[PDB]
Amino acid sequence: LRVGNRYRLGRKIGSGSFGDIYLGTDIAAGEEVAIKLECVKTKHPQLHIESKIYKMMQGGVGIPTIRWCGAEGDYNVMVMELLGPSLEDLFNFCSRKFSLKTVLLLADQMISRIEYIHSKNFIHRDVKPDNFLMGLGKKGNLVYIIDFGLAKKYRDARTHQHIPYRENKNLTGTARYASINTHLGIEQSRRDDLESLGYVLMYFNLGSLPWQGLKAATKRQKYERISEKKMSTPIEVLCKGYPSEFATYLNFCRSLRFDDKPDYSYLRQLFRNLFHRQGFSYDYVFDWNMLK
């Protein structure tokens, strides 16, 4: 298929919940791209919404470039920079073990990506390893964030008036990485993206979280069981056997007020000081770079 005149559709490379991703070629440029397609007649149109958020994000480091948006035949179309494997994919490729160095290289960039989104007046609300992708080629050392399907404005662009506190929210995103405040049904804010990152980092450290693979028939009972395990696992128990910085990070996130601006710089400096105490260099040599 020809798309937006200059793009050629190739084979599927990924299946989302709200769109499939296809390999493509920018025939004019001689460059591979990713093409996201959404059936025009989909019950729940989201691609046009996601594209608007990407436009507001554009020019960020580790934000995929949007090359073209249109409709074509029975599809809404978004053409974007082609990225590499997700951190979940690379975790599986690494036998579900990341070195401390890799976890800290990732933590540094992931805190910066979340800060960048927050600087653009959005919270992501689906912080999980599947939504962070390494670049390809020259961008291969760069962590990207994707899937702004669930993203939401947390403050007025103009006034910076924060969204109001709200309760009795149904659980938006993946329960495994959801904040305790999300489990309580509280409106998500900047703190919740960062608390989710904290669970992602301990997930990379452990290979799994203690509230993973809990048995339930129905879904709300599964979320209640995840909530109960999360709220009965002290941060010092979750983080036992790992550097204290992972616990300090999570304690900091749990202490944030609904409308607080997180101290992103403090959280990066926490991991940077540990990184330096270990004698690591920021040379972007990740575990997966050493697979032969």
Ligand SMILES: Nc1ncnc2c1ncn2[C@@H]1O[C@H](COP(=O)(O)O)[C@@H](O)[C@H]1O
């Ligand atoms: N720009 C991209 N480059 C490569 N793979 C992508 C890209 N965007 C999404 N994917 C993949 O497509 C799936 C999810 O698409 P999405 O609905 O955009 O989150 C996952 O398998 C992602 O790894």
